[PDB]
Design a protein around this ligand. Structure first.
Ligand SMILES: Nc1ncnc2c1ncn2[C@@H]1O[C@H](COP(=O)(O)OP(=O)(O)OP(=O)(O)O)[C@@H](O)[C@H]1O
Ligand SMILES: Nc1ncnc2c1ncn2[C@@H]1O[C@H](COP(=O)(O)OP(=O)(O)OP(=O)(O)O)[C@@H](O)[C@H]1O
Ligand SMILES: Nc1ncnc2c1ncn2[C@@H]1O[C@H](COP(=O)(O)OP(=O)(O)OP(=O)(O)O)[C@@H](O)[C@H]1O
Ligand SMILES: Nc1ncnc2c1ncn2[C@@H]1O[C@H](COP(=O)(O)OP(=O)(O)OP(=O)(O)O)[C@@H](O)[C@H]1O
Ligand SMILES: Nc1ncnc2c1ncn2[C@@H]1O[C@H](COP(=O)(O)OP(=O)(O)OP(=O)(O)O)[C@@H](O)[C@H]1O
Ligand SMILES: [Mg+2]
Ligand SMILES: [Mg+2]
Ligand SMILES: [Mg+2]
Ligand SMILES: [Mg+2]
Ligand SMILES: [Mg+2]
Ligand SMILES: [Mg+2]
Ligand SMILES: [Mg+2]
Ligand SMILES: [Mg+2]
Ligand SMILES: [Mg+2]
Lengths: 311, 311, 311, 311, 311, 311
DNA sequence: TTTTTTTTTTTTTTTTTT
């Protein structure tokens, strides 16, 4: 993590830097990621300044073709966050993977929110125990965040519940526009490097309501795509994992069919389908993954959150 | 509760404030919750004006990421409204929870309407007695609201009947559009802060009839989702509990199956299934709950409404 | 009761009224209850015309939240129609209550049609005698309406026989579609305000035949639900009582099981189950009631219709 | 009776009339009674054609609410067909009544078939002598029709036997599907208006065999219900009396229990139970009657068929 | 492959070569393909110099009309890169073809990224094994490149894993402008002649986000068209195969519709539609090819990457 | 065809002949068509020399008003080249006519390249077989020229494949300037008189990329107009048919819309729109034809190239 | 003269038999 202040010594005045920090650009990588057309929109920034900044940023970090062997070593930094269920972790290859977007969808009571709360605790577990040992950023759109539940789970893992709660940042996304604003501003908070997980529950809850009908569909997906693109951009640059929960819908024309359309399906690197099972058992199926094959596992929602049926 | 009049001092034209109030926005929080798009649709509100309003509202209340510990403290201000049955309260964690949507569905004569009447009285009980000590807003779609029943229950709890009735606001939702309108204008009435409960009995009664067939299914669910979203928005802002009763349907393709589809299931934070039992006993099962595990309890419908079998 | 003509002086075109009256909308209340989407269907009615009408209706009658105490006073206008059996009336709370749907189902020869004939006479009895002192609208689907029977009952009550017949309107529903059409056009007849009771005998007789099989089950219930919804609306506006007789069915999978499914069970506010007893005695049990507890009584079918065993 | 040909005057082309006549719709009343969705089922009939047919029929016959006094005069045309036993006639109110379905069930040798043959002769007797002076349509499923028996009875009543036989239309129902078809095409023969009685002997004999087991029980009743619906339907338009004989079954779980279930019990307007008596005497009990009280009478089977014990 | 240094001896000073080399012109062919107007844009390059360069370039390589027979001989240099599925290769005529742009589009989890990973291995296979025996350039826009997956596939083909990775160059396209910049300077790397394949996954991912709305649609396609044109230019000049993956979209107005519009469809020589099949089977349909007819094949995603269903 | 050597006899200096040939002038008709300003533009050409050359050319060929009968007799020399589809040839009036420019546009995979390849073979067929029996000049801008496809089509038509290929001249148009140069020096090759067809596929591919934005739109259209004018001049002079393939674009503001604008629309004498049809069927519609009325035909793309659906 | 975009949403019980 290199702060935009690093640009200052290369020859950029501090006055511009605040404009960059004003526009939500607190890291050098975010400078390279942002397009020149977008930087120009930043207030107090001219095309001459934008070009100057971009040239300076390249002087610090070089981006270009590199041998896949080198990209393998960089890939070593990725964390695998335990979901609390060893069977579910096995199919996922270790759990939720950082630097990528993971999505879970299914009917109600299927454990989507419960899994999010479990990740809030396990994420704080030290590496080699399924966790990344870092803070968690929680974005609530359903309104079901329960701090007591995290404390109860933390006790199951034998962690100080007060300490675990402190390492979780909670934001309530009142509407889609607010939800997008929260994500765009995560750059400053994440720049510290403490965070490891970003949870959006649920991704499409607000978008479903704000944009209604055929006419709004085109604008809805375009806004959602930019929202997803930013989330994916955040995950890669800060090495944090993005966990998204999604609803489902019934298809009268024709597992359950998720919502969000193709824009969400393409953006999500990993998608898991959660179904109700006999009694309290749940069935998780890995619909889409970049590195793991399709499989199913059985998990149970218990005191410790998501855990193995026997566990 | 901050009235929109607060924006007046920050520089909002008094004429505009009326438009907001005419637009059903009587609180500062409702301003932050409402999207900039929706505000523009308000008559006499220009896109330029909305910027000042939203910026002014932000000046008063700051919304952003906060430590989970702080959100835990804010969580303390939630009430738990006794359902009249101690056993049913135990599985629910204390009763119906404010800031969340609770839905009870089941076959006929299972006590859905009876439970709603019980909550009308218990809600008026002082806190530490299972109630919230506040007014109740009752929205009737079945047409079975019975003021005499509330009086009979109030005597069972040793409360003044006529005084108990005065604290209940009853609205008869003739059709789905009217039902949607009533919820929108609850902002003004709730702004006083006296109300503690909102009862919709039942949620899908009107939506079932207005939108008939698969052709109108998409429109029906879209309207219902916005209706449910507004109800959830009201509950969080005013710290009121939303209690919904729902019908059930027989599934020839395959506890009873509820109606409303996945839109209602996702929106509802808590769902209780009520079944007929031996004699006058009923069985309640907690299908979905953000914080409590699945459980079953037996309750009875007596003079005091919903009560324990022994009681 | 306010006719739609009252809408005219508020600014409604006289020509539009015929279109409204043509659509079976003869009262102001029916205007408010009817949704805008349905009004747009009416011939020669444009959305602007539909819009203008709605506010005009609003200017005449105000619909919104009101204190429960006020609703209690409105509830005072309810009528309780004697069923002829004092013991049966006691459990019912006084008899059949207007503004609610009452459904009696049971085996053959259980008196379902006998009560319908009894209600035809008692309804004409002046209030304080168990009646409503009003006309009766009788819709027949069984085909067992017997004007001679009503004359015999009337002589039992020392009422003028021919006078009693005059105040009864008889309609024979040939099929489900004709049955629904009769109900929709009751608005003009009920607008006079004389009618107190509406009798459908039996509700599901036609719906059973017209829609046969799994494929037509979904359409049958949807059509039935709209039919029941309209009946419930008629009772509320015109303060009439809706009395429904229903058939029963045997349940090989597992008191008799009624037909009509959950749609009928939810719609009906009160449901009485009639069984055969020793000799000519019958047993009536109150399965579902919004305001009275479960009870059983014994009644007899005699010269004066439904009567108490001793009576 | 008005033939569908009258529909020609109001604008129905002769081509369509044949299509209706193809579907067995030979009367104006049958057009009104038949549902629109059923008419569209007719081959070569479009919804527009079906629509045009209905209002054209409406212009001829008006169906709607009418004073019960008027319905009393229409009811005045009913016929009471002597059963041959004066005591049995008295309890029934005069004998079998047209426009209603009469069912007699009991053990073997109880006179069910003998009564059917007696009705064949008596029906031809002129009114004021117990008969309706009209033809008799006989449907046989037992296969026990005995034309020589009718001739013997006719001699007892002192009327011409061969002329008596000529006025009887006999059909042998080979299977349930054939039996249902015969009823549907009774409209053609009945349209003449000569017929007064319809005999089905026995109603459930064929249905019992064709649909065997609980698997087909649901389909059997649905088919039987539609079959009974038309029989009741046919009686009303043509003012003919439908006489049904039914078998009985022993009930190990627990007068004899009839077969056919509730579907037959509800549809049957009148039901008489026949039991064996001392010697050749028989006992008849009126289980269900829309207009007469329960009673028992003793009758004998003699040369003239069903006759009074002393007679 | 002729380097621009070859141009120097014809009379071009080394200093100018640096400017053209700086402008991404590293081969003699690139000089001829590049327009004079474009060369004038290069710094330190005057029109006189451009004319001198272009005339000198013609002195080395002459471009003009040639007999189709000669063109056939040159066409022999084309490679066919196996996609791993013999059935898929058969319809394609041998696999992916160099000197042309191949685009595979389809719904998520359809193997688009899997094919790209598979092509990374097979491309290193020696000729007559389905590969080109050359390096691979990988451009990532979704961010799903997985070096581990390449190693696992390499073992399936019995190739040294680390050796296969060393021969793959990976570049991460942060945004559309960066993606275009990578391609423009990609000429230098390809100049060595080792590379045989170029993978863009996905082509339209960035362009979708950077340019939003009808207002920016015109600019988006123009930039995309220039991007595709350069890719096509690279493939022909260096005899490398360009493999592109594309997303799909739902068409509410009316096989899945791809994104990118007509600009992408025209530019792509070969287009394959990947569709989900029963279980693990996928269906590949050849929508557009210059030399092969439409066909469909079934392939599976296994440990060895894309493989035949039985394979 | 008359070469400039004919001019030399009348008194034209040989050096002037070499200069004019260097200026792309090899025929008397080219001398007459070229304006005196353009001729003076040629290096080493003086105004006196240009005047002398023009006067000598006029002395060889005289251009002036002639009777329409003579023009019809000359028009008799025109050929009609079969497109492979009998219906398409019929609608076109016999196929592609020489001395005119023909353009086909449509979506991808609509057979534009396939149609050009089919023409490449059919042109070699002798007269009365639909061909012109002459060499074909092919200019490629897409890059999809396929000698193998030409060989396969020739075998389908029963022609020697290598002989057919030898008679096809192929030029690859790297950029718009190169394409214009190739067209300019087509004159010398066409001087031989062997060629009958000139194919540009596609016309606007290079112009779309070289000139971008409304800023350069005017220059792009001017260059395209000069290009099309030169092509038409060549077609008229050498009695060859010019076949052009064009892309299409979507029109958000508002059969597909072609590109190239009014310049291309006016320049093209004939324009055929190709659309996708059910299965392998394609639909060709004659948008603009100087001599034939609008029509539609159906063709299929098979082994023999463009062929009729049944064939 | 130029340039396409983007999916949504479940419903409804029947019926004795010996
Ligand atoms: N005042 C009362 N005293 C006693 N019992 C009552 C009273 N009011 C209602 N009940 C009982 O409550 C039941 C009424 O059904 P209720 O409305 O509670 O069920 P529900 O689950 O809401 O079903 P539905 O939605 O179909 O009405 C009956 O069992 C009735 O006896
Ligand atoms: N006018 C009358 N005088 C005396 N008793 C009568 C009279 N009308 C009917 N009854 C008696 O009352 C009963 C009639 O029952 P009713 O017709 O109400 O049955 P139901 O259960 O409604 O029938 P269904 O099976 O058609 O629904 C019979 O037992 C009959 O003897
Ligand atoms: N000609 C006759 N004279 C007198 N009695 C007769 C005559 N024919 C038949 N019977 C009597 O009438 C009855 C005829 O049996 P019937 O066909 O009526 O039986 P059921 O009860 O209708 O039906 P099933 O026997 O098939 O169950 C017997 O009791 C028989 O003795
Ligand atoms: N390494 C792997 N091992 C096994 N199966 C895998 C592997 N990688 C992916 N899969 C399977 O292949 C599918 C995903 O393929 P892929 O990622 O190519 O999809 P895609 O259609 O390209 O995705 P997108 O929607 O992002 O464009 C899933 O069913 C997944 O289980
Ligand atoms: N030998 C062949 N026989 C038949 N069809 C073929 C053959 N080779 C290729 N095709 C078909 O040719 C089609 C492509 O047609 P073509 O490229 O001419 O279209 P177009 O209208 O020029 O569109 P675009 O300019 O966008 O490529 C593909 O659908 C492919 O299946
Ligand atoms: Mg949740
Ligand atoms: Mg994906
Ligand atoms: Mg209720
Ligand atoms: Mg939920
Ligand atoms: Mg018999
Ligand atoms: Mg009956
Ligand atoms: Mg992918
Ligand atoms: Mg193409
Ligand atoms: Mg092409």
């Amino acid at each position: 993590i290199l702060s935009v202040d690093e640009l200052q010594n290369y020859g950029i005045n501090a006055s511009d830097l605040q404009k960059l920090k004003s526009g939500g650009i607190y890291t050098v990588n975010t400078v390279l990621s942002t397009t020149r057309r977008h930087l120009c929109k930043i207030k107090g920034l001219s095309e001459v300044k934008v070009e100057k900044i971009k040239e300076a940023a390249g002087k610090i970090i070089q981006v270009g073709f590199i041998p896949a062997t080198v990209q393998l070593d960089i890939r070593q930094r990725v964390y695998s966050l335990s979901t609390g269920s060893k069977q579910l972790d096995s199919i996922l290859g270790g759990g939720i993977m950082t630097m990528s977007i993971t999505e879970v969808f299914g009917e109600f009571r299927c454990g989507k929110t419960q899994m999010s709360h479990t990740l809030c605790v396990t994420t704080q577990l030290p590496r080699e125990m399924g966790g990344g040992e870092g803070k968690v950023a929680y974005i609530d759109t359903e309104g079901t965040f329960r701090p007591e539940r995290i404390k109860q789970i933390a006790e199951g893992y034998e962690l100080d519940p007060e300490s675990c709660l402190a390492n979780v940042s909670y934001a309530r996304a009142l509407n889609s526009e607010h939800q997008m604003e929260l994500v765009e501003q995560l750059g400053e908070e994440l720049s510290s490097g403490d965070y490891r997980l970003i949870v959006v529950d649920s991704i499409m809850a607000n978008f479903r309501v704000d944009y209604c009908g055929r006419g709004e569909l085109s604008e809805r997906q375009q806004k959602l795509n930019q929202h997803l693109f930013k989330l994916n951009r955040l995950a890669e640059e800060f090495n944090v994992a993005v966990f998204l929960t999604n609803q489902v819908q019934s298809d009268p024309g024709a597992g359950r069919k998720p919502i969000g359309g193709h824009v969400l399906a393409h953006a999500s690197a990993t998608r898991i389908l959660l179904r109700k099972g006999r009694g309290d058992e749940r069935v998780a199926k890995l619909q889409d993954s970049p590195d793991m094959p399709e499989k199913e596992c059985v998990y149970v929602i218990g005191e410790k959150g998501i855990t193995d049926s026997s566990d």
